[PDB]
Design a protein around this ligand. Structure first.
Ligand SMILES: [Ca+2]
Length: 291
């Protein structure tokens, strides 16, 4: 149904061959933030059938209003709902601790992931994303110790499922991370980009991380500007897609949602594709590998 993932030095293996998959990221799961209406089994089914998506990413809010801190069971439920649907539809599912300062609530993240590990640890579909987007923060002094603690907790329960760690400066500093990898099994590192804002320079940093023996994973990328607005940068988008395809980098487009911003796949209150949506759909359906 779904081949298990393993990280061997530089790349991610699905079963026994180097592979990469394309997918979608839901918007914030926070109560009242709109994206939550897409955390349904019906939507996941639509991505597998209509889009041919192989990945669905649950972006669980943590410290903002309506997030996991304010409503734990409420948010935990939307995630479980999406993961169960992904498992049923032969797709990979990323459970993401959608934070910008995760080091602030370490025990909370540990509590959450232990439960998720116990519940989903044996299905080859689940992937853990323990720190969405770290800011101007040190890798070795802030992100690494936090990540190691969480990974330690997970690994005690689930010894082999892929864990993805956020990198400094909006998950752009993957080179900085490669110079001080985490000594653990099946760990990947996140890279986030927005084709309307980031280019070849960010691609070079990625190349450097790849050269140092670290496997990357694009848990979030936009065809539009970093603030989620502006138009689609067609050229940069293509260049980025070729880069990921070449290096077998899995990716999740941000976000299958209908907020009134360029990054959304649908126009407000509709299933009518935006410029971004049409583009990403084409990208997702012609991807070389499927879950
Ligand atoms: Ca496992």
């Amino acid at each position: 149904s779904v081949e298990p993932l393993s990280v061997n030095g530089n790349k991610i293996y699905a079963g026994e061959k180097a592979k990469s998959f394309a997918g979608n990221s839901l918007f914030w799961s926070n109560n009242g933030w709109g994206g939550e209406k897409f955390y349904t089994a019906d939507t996941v089914a639509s991505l597998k059938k209509d889009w041919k998506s192989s990945i669905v990413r649950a972006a669980m809010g943590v410290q903002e209003s309506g997030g996991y801190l304010q409503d734990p069971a409420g948010n935990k439920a939307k995630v479980e709902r999406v993961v169960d649907a992904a498992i049923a539809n032969d797709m990979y599912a990323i459970i993401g601790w959608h934070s910008h300062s995760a080091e602030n609530n370490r025990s909370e993240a540990i509590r959450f992931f232990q439960e998720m590990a116990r519940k989903y640890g044996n299905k080859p579909n689940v992937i853990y994303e323990i720190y969405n987007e770290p800011l101007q923060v040190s890798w070795s002094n802030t992100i690494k110790p936090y990540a190691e603690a969480v990974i330690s907790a997970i690994r005690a329960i689930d010894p082999d499922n892929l864990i993805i760690v956020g990198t400094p400066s909006w998950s752009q500093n993957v080179d900085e991370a490669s110079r001080d990898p985490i000594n653990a099994k099946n760990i990947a590192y996140t890279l986030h980009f927005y084709a309307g804002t980031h280019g070849e320079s960010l691609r070079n940093k990625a190349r450097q991380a790849l050269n140092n023996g670290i496997a990357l994973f694009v848990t979030e990328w936009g065809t539009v500007n970093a603030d989620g607005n502006g138009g689609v940068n067609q050229t940069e988008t293509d260049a980025w897609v070729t880069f990921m395809r070449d290096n077998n980098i899995s990716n999740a487009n941000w976000a299958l949602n209908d907020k009134n911003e360029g990054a959304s796949t649908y126009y407000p209150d509709s299933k009518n594709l935006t410029e971004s949506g049409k583009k990403v759909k084409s990208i997702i359906q012609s991807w070389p590998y499927k879950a």
